[PDB]
């Protein structure tokens, strides 16, 4: 059998007995075949419905207990066996099971002892009976329990970012059934940025919270803090959903969605105007975004007809998410909490944003069609259909009841997207996976991302360039090195994926679905330098981490034995020139221009050998993979020599060699050289323009302002005529016009 064989039988008996009572009485015999087709999240709901009408069947109840045993949910499996046993006492083997499971999970309660006594009298002195007798004894005493707790706490003092240890603390709290302390630490720990990124931790967070909700302790204590803990569950669900989608398979991700949707429906009813309501707002968006990402995962593997329909469906999901407004940040109790919530908001808008674009670039106003056709409530049922099995009750599912009202159907603005990204750099702990995705998403757009601003948000007060550039010691790491690094990681990543699809769209993949986009070498480096800077390394591993970084520095700075293809160096050079040429301050201009000249000075020797059609000495285990896809050709050499000569002139101007800079700039009639010529002619005029000074000099001063006006006009004249020149502008066109207005009124 398969999935088709069992889900097609749904319509077989549905057409023979359509009333609700008989539809549910077939649940056990429906569930009979899903247990065989390896569907346990589905089989669970089928049998549970038959139990809703046939609540006195010992066979059905045991079958659910046996299914919860495979799910390893001890508390749920035991109770199911209990019902089957109390209905039918002749089920001896179940009395053993109950005693077997009660003694394995926890002995603190005498209930495990009681069921063991009965199990003994049903199987006099059987081999299992003693086995259970030894198991019950194993558990430690009061002094023993306190002893373990101190280890974890003393262990957590110096290792607060250890996933396993914090998990054990929640399990120890749960073993003493002081769940309030379990959630309390669970709540104070959702502020940890590292733990929030841990898949296994968030899974434990979902359970320890749910356990507390149903726990007797939650009701007795009070109903005031009930809302507070409920927020964290939603937060945990969001984090858990992001991670499950990337690592886990299609089946597991879909199942988590149902728990997410169940939580949303249970939360929306309370409402209010506090942190929980604001949290519900932001989490609502995440749901669709991840749901859209989930949709695209299925379609990737599937055929073309499903791909378009699913991508159409996903496009709507991301749209719903993007529309959701920025959550009310002021409304939260604390700075940490509110800052977190906004960080996630930026993540939602950023990820969904780029996806919305990459899906809309496929066709003309593709977004408009998506809304006009599927914004209809008919889409709401087509969405629920593709994601979930229709058998589940469509009433308590948040997805089926949401009011899809007035979808903005407005494509995102790039400027808004940049500030969303920058604000969400710390969303996923700056994993090189995160940044390499963003960097690639901007690779198809006409505006480039503020990478240097990303790094400033991550490594605060890290100087743009280090004074002690002579050595490669990793205490001299600079934001330039990182910026230079990320550039290669993305330039490398793009080429690797380009090669992959050629053998077999690359932009369209969502962030969770795609696999590692960087080499494990690159990832190891970034994780090292990250742990080092933020001061979350290990005294023992310091020397190792320190050396791992040092190894690659000589490559990021194009020093001895750099594994750098000439094209990547050129790419670094121009990308830094134009990055620096748009900066306002001199410190940054100088730095970025210096490095650009540096890489240029290293390439030109290579280009000359390539200019005569010779061979480049290929590298030894390069840090940035070489590719013949972008190997430099003679057709482009003369351009680089020219574009490089500009970078030389620019730095010459910044250093003071104006005479040599102008002589070079004037040699080449380029749009960029005008903006430079003008900007420096304007400064020589403005300073001397109004102070009391020799009249002849004043006329010479004015003469420069006359040259400034002319060069700006050449820019706009040549700019309006041709689009290719508009893209060469070192600054925006409107910025050029802005100066001109002030230049002439002077």
């Amino acid at each position: 059998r398969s999935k088709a064989d069992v889900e097609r039988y749904i319509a077989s008996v549905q057409g023979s007995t359509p009333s609700p009572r008989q539809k549910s009485m077939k649940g056990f015999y429906f569930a009979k075949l899903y247990y065989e087709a390896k569907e346990y999240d589905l089989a669970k709901k089928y049998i549970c419905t038959y139990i809703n009408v046939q609540e006195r069947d010992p066979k059905a109840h045991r079958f659910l207990g046996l299914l919860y045993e495979l799910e390893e949910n001890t508390d749920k499996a035991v109770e199911c066996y209990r019902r089957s046993v109390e209905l039918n006492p002749t089920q001896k083997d179940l009395v053993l099971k109950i005693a077997e499971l009660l003694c394995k999970n926890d002995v603190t309660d005498g209930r495990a002892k009681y069921w063991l006594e009965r199990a003994a009298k049903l199987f006099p002195g059987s081999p299992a009976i003693y086995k259970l007798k030894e198991q019950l004894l194993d558990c430690e005493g009061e002094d023993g329990w306190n002893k373990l707790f101190d280890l974890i706490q003393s262990e957590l003092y110096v290792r607060p970012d250890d996933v396993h240890v914090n998990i054990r603390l929640v399990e120890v709290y749960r073993s003493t059934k002081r769940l309030k302390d379990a959630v309390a630490h669970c709540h104070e720990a959702e502020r940890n940025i590292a733990l929030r990124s841990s898949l296994e931790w968030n899974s434990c967070v979902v359970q320890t919270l749910k356990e507390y909700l149903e726990s007797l302790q939650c009701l007795e204590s009070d109903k005031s803090d009930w809302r507070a803990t409920n927020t964290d569950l939603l937060l945990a669900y969001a984090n858990l959903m992001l991670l499950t989608l990337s690592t886990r398979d299609v089946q597991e991700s879909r199942e988590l969605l149902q728990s997410f949707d169940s939580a949303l429906q249970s939360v929306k009813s309370l409402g209010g105007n506090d942190e929980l309501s604001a949290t519900f707002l932001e989490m609502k968006g995440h749901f669709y975004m991840h749901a859209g990402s989930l949709l695209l995962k299925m379609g990737q593997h599937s055929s073309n007809v499903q791909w378009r329909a699913l991508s159409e469906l996903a496009a709507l999901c991301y749209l719903i998410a993007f529309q959701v407004p920025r959550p009310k940040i002021k409304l939260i109790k604390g700075e940490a909490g509110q800052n977190l919530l906004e960080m996630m908001a930026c993540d939602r808008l950023s990820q969904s944003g780029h996806m919305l674009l990459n899906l809309s670039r496929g066709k003309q106003d593709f977004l408009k069609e998506i809304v006009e056709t599927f914004a209809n409530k008919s889409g709401q049922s087509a969405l629920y259909d593709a994601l979930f099995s229709s058998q589940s009750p469509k009433d308590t599912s948040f997805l089926g009841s949401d009011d899809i009202g007035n979808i903005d159907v407005r494509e995102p603005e790039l400027e808004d997207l940049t500030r969303y990204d920058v604000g969400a750099i710390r969303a996923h702990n700056g994993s090189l996976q995160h940044l390499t995705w963003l960097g690639l998403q901007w690779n198809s757009l006409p505006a480039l991302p503020g990478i240097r601003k990303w790094l400033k948000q991550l490594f605060h007060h890290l100087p743009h360039e280090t004074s002690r550039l002579e050595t490669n010691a990793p205490e001299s790491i600079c934001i330039l090195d990182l910026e230079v690094f990320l550039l290669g990681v993305v330039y490398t990543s793009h080429l690797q994926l380009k090669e992959k699809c050629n053998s077999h769209q690359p932009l369209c993949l969502p962030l969770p679905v795609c696999k590692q986009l960087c080499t494990e070498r690159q990832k190891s480096w970034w994780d090292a330098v990250c742990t080092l800077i933020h001061r979350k390394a290990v005294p023992g591993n310091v020397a190792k981490l320190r050396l791992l970084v040092q190894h690659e520095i000589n490559t990021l700075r194009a020093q001895e034995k750099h594994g750098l293809q000439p094209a990547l160096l050129v790419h670094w050079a121009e990308c830094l020139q134009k990055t620096g040429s748009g900066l306002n301050s001199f410190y940054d201009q100088r730095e970025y221009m210096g490095r650009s000249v540096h890489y240029w000075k290293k390439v030109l020797p290579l280009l000359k050998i390539i200019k005569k059609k010779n061979s480049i000495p290929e590298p030894i285990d390069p840090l940035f993979k070489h590719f013949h896809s972008v190997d430099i050709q003679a057709s482009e050499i003369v351009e680089y020599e020219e574009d490089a000569h500009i970078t030389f002139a620019v730095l010459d101007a910044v250093n003071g060699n104006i005479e040599d800079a102008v002589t070079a700039f004037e040699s080449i009639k380029s749009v960029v050289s005008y903006w430079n010529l003008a900007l420096i002619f304007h400064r020589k005029a403005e300073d001397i323009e109004n102070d009391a000074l020799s009249p002849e000099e004043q006329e010479e001063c004015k003469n420069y302002l006359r040259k400034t006006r002319d060069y700006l006009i050449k820019i706009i004249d040549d700019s309006d005529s041709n689009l290719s020149v508009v893209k060469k502008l070192p600054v925006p066109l409107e910025s050029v016009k802005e100066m001109l207005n002030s230049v002439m009124q002077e």
Partner: antibody
Amino acid sequence: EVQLVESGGGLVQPGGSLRLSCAASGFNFSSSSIHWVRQAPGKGLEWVASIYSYSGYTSYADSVKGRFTISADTSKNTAYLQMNSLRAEDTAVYYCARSPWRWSGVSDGGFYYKALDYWGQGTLVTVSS
Amino acid sequence: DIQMTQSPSSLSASVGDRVTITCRASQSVSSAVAWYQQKPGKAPKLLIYSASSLYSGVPSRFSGSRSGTDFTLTISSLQPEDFATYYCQQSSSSLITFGQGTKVEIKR
């Protein structure tokens, strides 16, 4: 261009709490180990706390163990000395200082710092009811 | 616990003298000792690190030396600006301890 500024001092009642701030600038705060050294009036130098350079494992003198807590923030490029259960004995001038990773060695049984190069002006803390 | 016993507690000398201060480590300690100069009320400044290595910027008349478990600061020719209190410091495993200090009073 390189300096350390102490703040967060002032007077407090015994059994109270204070928090000192050691603001650093000019050297990479990540690769530096941070220390605190108090000095009562007319008395000598007493080491009270340390922070290993690249990770930040704490270590305190038994005279203040468990009461004080020293921390380092990369985003704010600043270290702090949280003081609780302050006693009249804690009245002293509190200095902070750094020790680069070049001078920070880790050994079996604990770590050592070769010397304290950069020192601060020193912020006063008086503890008297 | 390791202890650094500094001697003498108070010293009196005049300009040009060759002055000596000594600190003894109770247990056998490796060469991870330092020396500091603290003028009244100001901050302590580093003179010698790693027992006998001079801190960049310190005058050449200062010199450190060790003999067994006894560490010694040596000033070849005392100057007027060196009349201040000095301290010796050991760095053992996850612990730092200072000597009682030595005041250098001008003799008259």
